[PDB]
Design a protein around this ligand. Structure first.
Ligand SMILES: *[C@@H]1O[C@H](CO)[C@@H](O[C@@H]2O[C@H](CO)[C@@H](O[C@@H]3O[C@H](CO)[C@@H](O)[C@H](O)[C@@H]3O)[C@H](O)[C@H]2NC(C)=O)[C@H](O)[C@H]1NC(C)=O
Ligand SMILES: *[C@@H]1O[C@H](CO)[C@@H](O[C@@H]2O[C@H](CO)[C@@H](O)[C@H](O)[C@H]2NC(C)=O)[C@H](O)[C@H]1NC(C)=O
Ligand SMILES: *[C@@H]1O[C@H](CO)[C@@H](O[C@@H]2O[C@H](CO)[C@@H](O)[C@H](O)[C@H]2NC(C)=O)[C@H](O)[C@H]1NC(C)=O
Ligand SMILES: *[C@@H]1O[C@H](CO)[C@@H](O[C@@H]2O[C@H](CO)[C@@H](O)[C@H](O)[C@H]2NC(C)=O)[C@H](O)[C@H]1NC(C)=O
Ligand SMILES: *[C@@H]1O[C@H](CO)[C@@H](O[C@@H]2O[C@H](CO)[C@@H](O)[C@H](O)[C@H]2NC(C)=O)[C@H](O)[C@H]1NC(C)=O
Ligand SMILES: *[C@@H]1O[C@H](CO)[C@@H](O)[C@H](O)[C@H]1NC(C)=O
Lengths: 49, 226, 216, 102, 172, 172, 172
């Protein structure tokens, strides 16, 4: 008992990110399965100390 | 569509706690900031808190700094606000408001918010050490004029509301019912009056029907000359 | 804190003529060609509905007679012809720097033909005098404009600080207001003085009117 | 006594809103539309060669149903099978009809 | 843009400039007027052009396409026929949506850049005769008529003629 | 980064600046001190928040997805059902890896630009009363006390008031 | 490019600089010579290195690929097999032609920035003792030997030593 749109066979996962990596099998409105397990999008400037 | 619905205020003695809850529906709650904005009685709008969609930036207006704590539950779609160590100055109706800006980045205390897009029901929080008394309904005696008028002064009750009517609601026109006023004792009183034709200041008997649900008080007075 | 100052305070115009309000900011609230100012209507016993955002766009629901305008540091809301479902307070707001701040509020009523009050004084009730303190009451009935003024006089000693008042909303047929006033004393001091009177001074009273009772 | 020179750029009374990397909507002096979204309503007969099947399915045409012998030996770039179309001869099925049309 | 001339130190653009994208406004002894700069206008348009042509030399001349609408419920093959198109169409949108949005943020920052360029062509002409007010405006420090500043516009400005005057107006 | 402001001509970053992202540390008669420039800091934050939201507006709500695992060895049809999916995934990842790259490259170049933009905007405002020290510090050439300084920070600094003083400190 | 140094305010390029990508050419009391500036010729080559390296690793390794050429006419299962691959192909080709087009535009603009970067490194060193002619050339306002040219290029110039000497040549 819990809300969650996107089902995999591994269990539910949320769709707030644009890309999953949990299973290419997917029922519901789920982020698209990409091969990489991490992709970081930079939200600040270059760090320099 | 969009719909915010607030919860759980009322009477609360000074120095003690309370916590409000806003239950959002009809939009993607988790991707928007939320605010609390309060309003003193018969006064204006103050801003109280913001909490980002992240749940991880939160800032408070100085008056409620570090007594209050704005909290958020993006799974159960509902916004909370802990009110510890309350006091007089905090008496107000309290409103949740939705930020206009999508996935805002409140990385700082000063950053610009969005406008206030939809607002909630509102919820009243009273902060006084008075415990409940009941209304003391006195009448008001007729006199001279062209057509004169008569009423019921309702002294020392707490908390609001009190609700009047005239002759089981069978008299409505000419009735005025004045908003309450808090005497320095802490108890509210109000006034209620009706102008009428003078040609029945005897025959037409006049029962006024007072009520105070919070003490279970019901009174009914009559209104006569001399 | 950025100080939002609204002006004027109260307004009033004839149902179907133009009305207009000003919000003055403590500093520019304009930034990258957006004016981070919004306007709210608030009718009583209710929250506020959003009227205008980004200084001059109408929120979907609003009808075409409302208009925001201005840029930087002075803004001006405009009801092009005041229909009667407008009587509310009107609040301007800035959201360009946290803490968001609001204007003080501009109550807009309906302008109408002048209207004298009808003044009635009441003495304290026999039931009451049994428990220690004593209350006199004064009632100003269906008058207009809003700005009446009662003054209590215990044996012609202008009273003060013991008296309270409140007024009703504007009526949805006549548009008069109506005022009640409660001079509270102890029974202690009620039994000394004989002449109680409230002296109403007001636009529709070419000179102050005084209503009074004697004790018996 | 001394002058001032100022550089600048032009504007219009109504630019178009476009999308960007950072901005959803942002107004520029002019746009152009990359998505075709409208149709004349009619198939042109040039420059491709169109054969209008009318009340024949292409399969029927081939099989040689009476009211389709109008089509014997015909040649088309694009064969346009009409929904008004029918068959009217011994009742048949073609397994992998799918493919025999194709 | 990224250069912060357009919608930056250049307060706002000019609606009374119908013969060009970038250009000049003077005030002086004789009067006041305005002219476009034709090279920097042509510069910008000549890119936005090629850019466009580039964005468009494609239209899928392939190739016996497959059935995509359906008369029946068929199960396995049909399913894949739909998955295969439904997928393609998803990708080819992403492709499109990315394309305009890059193309557009560049198309913007590029024209901002050109307004900088014109500005640096002009400062470098006025070596020590002028100063940057800060709002895309130069204060020359010498008397300059409608034939003078015409030199500046058409790149034929000598700075040593006026130097002695200008310097003395500035530093004295 | 493209502009050379950050990670370059400004030696390194100020770890003690917590009010915002861009700033002013000074030194004059009334000791030293720091202050954060907001009109900038928001400017960047805006752009990021902005592309953040552009980047995430999609979730592949596309129809019946075929079977992707298989219990038995089958042949031609099963083979095509894997190839289709395998190929889909490979592109989606290519897309995915390129987005992060372009975006991130841009995000850096963008924050760089804003630094430089501040530094220009300031130098302009300082018309003829300081010189670029080289390291992204100025040398204001008069006695500018904490009053005056803030003027320059929040825009109000009128250069003419000083000039006399500073022209003389520079060339005498 | 964007920054408009190369193919811009710097007329054209030196076909006889063969030890570097950016540099200086002098004319002084002692004659006429040239040197590469290394730091910048490195940082321009160092991004291109990364960039290339980034574009490359990347090779499609999967999985019992479907048959692609066909020796019969089979209608539907084939019609799909081809369209699956036919479609894939068009995607990668686009996917490719975009990458190269993107990368380049940038490679071209970053190399441009590096020049303009080296232009402004110099300008700030020669604080007051020179003035930009606008053809990518300064006019130093004093006597400067081979030992002083080479002192500029290796970061060790001392504006203050030739200060007084500089100002008289400019103004009087
Ligand atoms: C910037 O250029 C765009 C196009 O690149 C301009 O829009 C164009 O406007 C013209 C004249 O109004 C249009 O021509 C005709 O429009 C009418 C429909 O209103 C009709 O007779 C024809 O269908 C015909 O197309 C035209 O549609 C349109 N663009 C294109 C590509 O055809 C725009 O005027 C320019 N922007 C500004 C601010 O001037
Ligand atoms: C989700 O469950 C599936 C079901 O097995 C997992 O996929 C396999 O994971 C294991 C463990 O790493 C491997 O031995 C296989 O190679 C995977 N198979 C394929 C075809 O990918 C998966 O690990 C689970 N993932 C998570 C995140 O829980
Ligand atoms: C082109 O024609 C097609 C039909 O082949 C249209 O697609 C239909 O559109 C309606 C209304 O939007 C939808 O209910 C269905 O998706 C389609 N109908 C059928 C029967 O498949 C399409 O809208 C037309 N568009 C234009 C621009 O002409
Ligand atoms: C660019 O403009 C200049 C100045 O407006 C023009 O110069 C010509 O020659 C003299 C020299 O300064 C000017 O006083 C005249 O106004 C012009 N006379 C003629 C006969 O053309 C000139 O038109 C342009 N420059 C060049 C090199 O063609
Ligand atoms: C960089 O190159 C310069 C320019 O030639 C070098 O200059 C020498 O510097 C020292 C003093 O620092 C002096 O003895 C001479 O004037 C120079 N010697 C020669 C052989 O030319 C210098 O080596 C470098 N700069 C620094 C600061 O080390
Ligand atoms: C800048 O802030 C200071 C006070 O901290 C003062 O010099 C001045 O009032 C401010 N300037 C502006 C334009 O607000």
């Amino acid at each position: 008992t819990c809300i969650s749109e996107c089902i995999t066979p591994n269990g539910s996962i949320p769709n707030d990110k644009p890309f999953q990596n949990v299973n290419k099998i997917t029922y519901g409105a789920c982020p698209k399965y990409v091969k990489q397990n991490t992709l970081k999008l930079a939200t600040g400037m270059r760090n320099v100390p | 569509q969009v719909q915010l619905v607030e919860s759980g205020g009322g009477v609360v003695q000074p120095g003690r706690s309370l916590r409000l809850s806003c239950a959002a529906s009809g939009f993607t709650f988790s991707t928007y900031a939320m605010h609390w904005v309060r309003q003193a009685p018969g006064k204006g709008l103050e801003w109280v808190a913001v909490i980002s969609y992240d749940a991880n930036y939160k800032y408070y207006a100085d008056s409620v700094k570090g007594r209050f704590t704005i909290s958020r539950d993006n799974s159960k779609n509902t916004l909370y606000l802990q009110m510890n160590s309350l006091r007089a100055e905090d008496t107000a109706v309290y409103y949740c408001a939705k930020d206009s800006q999508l996935r805002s980045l409140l990385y700082f205390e000063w950053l610009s918010q969005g406008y206030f897009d939809y607002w909630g029901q509102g919820t009243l929080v009273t902060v006084s050490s008075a415990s409940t008394k009941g209304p003391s309904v006195f009448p008001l005696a007729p006199s001279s004029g062209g057509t004169a008028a008569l009423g019921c002064l309702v002294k020392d009750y707490f908390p609001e509301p009190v609700t009047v009517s005239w002759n089981s609601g069978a008299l409505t026109s000419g009735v005025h019912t004045f908003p309450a006023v808090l005497q320095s004792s802490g108890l509210y009183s109000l006034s209620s009056v009706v102008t009428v034709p003078s040609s029945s200041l005897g025959t037409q008997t006049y029962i006024c029907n007072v009520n105070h649900k919070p003490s279970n008080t019901k009174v009914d007075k009559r209104v006569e000359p001399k | 804190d950025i100080v939002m100052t609204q002006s004027p305070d109260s307004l009033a115009v004839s149902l179907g003529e133009r009305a207009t309000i000003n919000c003055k900011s403590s500093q520019s609230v304009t930034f990258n060609y957006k004016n981070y100012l919004a306007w709210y209507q608030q009718k009583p016993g209710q929250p506020p509905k959003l009227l205008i955002y980004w200084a001059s766009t109408r929120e979907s629901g609003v009808p075409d007679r409302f208009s925001g305008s201005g840029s930087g540091t002075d803004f001006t809301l405009t009801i092009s012809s005041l229909q009667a479902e407008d009587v509310a307070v009107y609040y301007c707001q800035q959201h360009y720097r946290t803490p968001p701040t609001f204007g003080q509020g501009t109550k807009v009523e309906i302008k109408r033909t002048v209207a004298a009050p009808s003044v009635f004084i009441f003495p304290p009730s026999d039931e009451q005098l049994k428990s220690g303190t004593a209350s006199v009451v004064c009632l100003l009935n269906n008058f207009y404009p809003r700005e009446a003024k009662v003054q209590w006089k215990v044996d012609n000693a202008l009273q003060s600080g013991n008296s309270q008042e409140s007024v009703t909303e504007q009526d949805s047929k006549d548009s008069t207001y109506s005022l009640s006033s409660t001079l509270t004393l102890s029974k202690a001091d009620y039994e000394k003085h004989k002449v109680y009177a409230c002296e109403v001074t007001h636009q529709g009273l070419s000179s102050p009117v005084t209503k009074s009772f004697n004790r018996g | 006594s001394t002058a001032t020179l100022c550089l600048g750029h032009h504007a219009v009374p109504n630019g178009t809103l476009v999308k960007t990397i950072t901005d959803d909507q942002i107004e520029v002096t002019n746009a152009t539309e990359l998505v075709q979204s409208s149709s004349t309503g009619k198939i042109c007969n040039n420059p491709h060669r169109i054969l209008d099947g009318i009340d024949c399915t292409l399969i029927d045409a081939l099989l040689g149903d009476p009211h389709c012998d109008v089509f014997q030996n015909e040649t088309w770039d694009l064969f346009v099978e009409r929904s008004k179309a029918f068959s009217n001869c011994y009742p048949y099925d073609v397994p992998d009809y799918a493919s025999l049309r194709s | 843009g990224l250069f912060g001339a357009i919608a930056g130190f250049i307060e706002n653009g000019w609606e009374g400039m119908i013969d060009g994208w970038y250009g000049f406004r003077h005030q002086n002894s004789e009067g006041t007027g305005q002219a476009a700069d034709l090279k920097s206008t042509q510069a910008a348009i000549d890119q936005i052009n090629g850019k466009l042509n580039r964005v468009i030399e494609k239209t899928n001349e392939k190739f016996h396409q497959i059935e995509k609408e359906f008369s029946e419920v068929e199960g396995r093959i049909q399913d894949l026929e739909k998955y295969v198109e439904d997928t393609k169409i998803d990708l080819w949108s992403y492709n499109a949506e990315l394309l305009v949005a890059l193309e557009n943020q560049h198309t913007i920052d590029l024209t901002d850049s050109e307004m900088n360029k014109l500005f640096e062509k002009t400062r470098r002409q006025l070596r020590e005769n002028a100063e940057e007010m800060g709002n895309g405006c130069f204060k020359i420090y010498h008397k300059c008529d409608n034939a003078c500043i015409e030199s500046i516009r058409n790149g034929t400005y000598d700075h040593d003629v006026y130097r002695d005057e200008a310097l003395n107006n500035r530093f004295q």
